[PDB]
Design a protein around this ligand. Structure first.
Ligand SMILES: CC(=O)N[C@@H]1[C@@H](O)[C@H](O[C@H]2O[C@H](CO)[C@@H](O[C@@H]3O[C@H](CO)[C@@H](O[C@@H]4O[C@H](CO)[C@@H](O[C@@H]5O[C@H](CO)[C@@H](O)[C@H](O)[C@H]5NC(C)=O)[C@H](O)[C@H]4NC(C)=O)[C@H](O)[C@H]3NC(C)=O)[C@H](O)[C@H]2NC(C)=O)[C@@H](CO)O[C@H]1O
Ligand SMILES: *[C@@H]1O[C@H](CO)[C@@H](O[C@H]2O[C@H](CO)[C@@H](O)[C@H](O)[C@H]2NC(C)=O)[C@H](O)[C@H]1NC(C)=O
Length: 361
């Protein structure tokens, strides 16, 4: 089983304990660590933060402690305009120029592969997304001829039925991609004003519409479309999505006036790192949707939907039963990486639970 863990560029800037460097990563925890995110300029892969070349190095020296560890760089991300990806992928000339610029870059910085996080291609991109994956892979095969190990190629895909129908030719890209990471946790889409869990496992028996929104449907749908199980990786979040209530109602359906207050370290409305949620729980009331098998908490007018150790062990058990390739975690720097925020003195509590269940067979 594979354990793909994302580490983000900008977590170095958080204050105090919030700050996280490649340093803090247990080399034996995951099988693959993906650095986010690389940028694109003058049509070539390129760096993003001034000090990336350094952190690139830091991350990749973990391979000295664990020689089996594989690292990848990710291009794209949500703060990267899809129009930009779209503009590069549509013109064979600008597309070829980018592809050709990738291998040398990965090799200089010691990465073992590239990860595509185009979020998200639209109806008019489906065809180009395919041209890009296909041609890029071909470039990796051709490059392995130089006598070095073939570079890996992966992609982060939307887990929403409509997004999948609109911009992905799943059957096509799965034959060229090494693994596909299902973004099964952006379900309660930023849009509406009703409390809801962003990463439910199951349908949530007590609800008629938007049954398409849960890990289970997404996974079954991908297999129906043609993605083989041995390349599917299910995304497990390590953060919580918060809300500022607009009434005293706290159960399913309750109204929402907007996103929740920022976390002390995370400084971003609507989300909270797991280690922040641990602190938050003190004095909070905890509930758990039996149907979807995921927890949620409230305190004051703040409602938080999140994942704890057992909801995470659950998804992991599920993924094994459907015989998928492994799990994907977003993200290491949001988990309790110091191990000093969540009761127990364990480091990376959430990612380990996934790893424990995965190591059982
Ligand atoms: C599978 C997959 O691909 N993942 C999906 C993700 O894309 C989803 O969301 C996540 O991605 C977005 C980015 O795409 C991420 O956005 C980040 O937001 C933060 C926090 O609000 C930004 O952090 C700030 O970054 C700037 C610079 O980049 C920092 O400023 C710098 O300051 C130093 C001095 O401090 C200077 O030396 C630098 O020059 C300087 N830059 C400037 C401004 O001059 C700043 O310190 C920092 N933090 C602060 C103040 O809080 C960060 O840049 C954004 N990311 C990028 C790469 O642009 C978003 O936070 C993230 N969401 C979560 C919850 O992780 C993900 C969401 O669910 O799921 C996947 O589907
Ligand atoms: C990512 O690459 C982009 C595009 O090359 C960089 O974009 C900006 O840089 C120019 C400065 O000379 C601006 O004139 C442009 O408005 C802008 N390019 C755009 C929007 O296409 C950007 O600096 C890079 N980002 C990082 C973190 O390096």
């Amino acid at each position: 089983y594979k354990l793909i863990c994302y580490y983000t560029s900008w977590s170095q800037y958080r204050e105090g304990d919030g700050s996280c460097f490649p340093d803090a990563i247990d080399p034996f925890l995951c099988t693959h660590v993906i650095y986010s995110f690389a940028n694109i300029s003058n049509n070539e892969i390129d760096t993003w933060e001034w000090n990336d070349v350094t952190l690139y190095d830091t991350l990749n020296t973990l391979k000295n402690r664990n020689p089996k560890l594989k690292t990848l760089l990710s291009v794209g991300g949500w703060n990267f305009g899809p129009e930009r990806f779209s503009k590069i992928a549509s013109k064979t000339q600008s597309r070829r120029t980018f592809i050709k610029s990738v291998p040398p870059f990965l090799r200089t910085h010691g990465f073992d592969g590239l990860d595509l996080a185009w979020l998200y291609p639209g109806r008019r991109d489906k065809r180009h997304l395919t041209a890009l994956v296909k041609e890029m892979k071909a470039e990796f095969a051709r490059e392995a001829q130089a006598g070095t190990e073939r570079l890996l190629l992966s992609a982060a895909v939307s887990a929403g039925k409509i997004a999948i129908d609109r911009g992905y030719d799943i059957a096509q890209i799965s034959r060229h991609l090494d693994f596909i990471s299902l973004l099964t946790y952006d379900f309660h889409g930023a849009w509406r004003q009703t409390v809801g869990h962003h990463s439910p496992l199951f349908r949530g028996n007590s609800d008629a519409s938007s049954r398409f929104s849960n890990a289970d449907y997404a996974v079954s749908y991908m297999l129906r479309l043609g993605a083989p199980a041995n390349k599917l990786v299910m995304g497990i979040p390590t953060f919580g999505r918060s809300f500022t209530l607009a009434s005293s109602k706290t159960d399913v359906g309750a109204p929402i006036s907007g996103p929740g207050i920022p976390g002390r370290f995370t400084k971003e409305k609507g989300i909270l790192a797991y280690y922040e949620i641990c602190d938050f729980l003190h004095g909070a009331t905890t509930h758990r949707f039996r149907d979807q098998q995921v927890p949620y908490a409230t305190k004051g007018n703040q409602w938080v939907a999140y994942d704890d150790q057992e909801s995470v062990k659950n998804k992991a058990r599920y993924l094994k039963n459907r015989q998928l390739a492994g799990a994907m975690v977003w993200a290491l720097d949001l988990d309790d990486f110091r191990g000093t925020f969540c009761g127990q003195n364990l480091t990376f509590p959430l990612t380990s639970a996934v790893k424990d269940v995965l190591a059982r067979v």
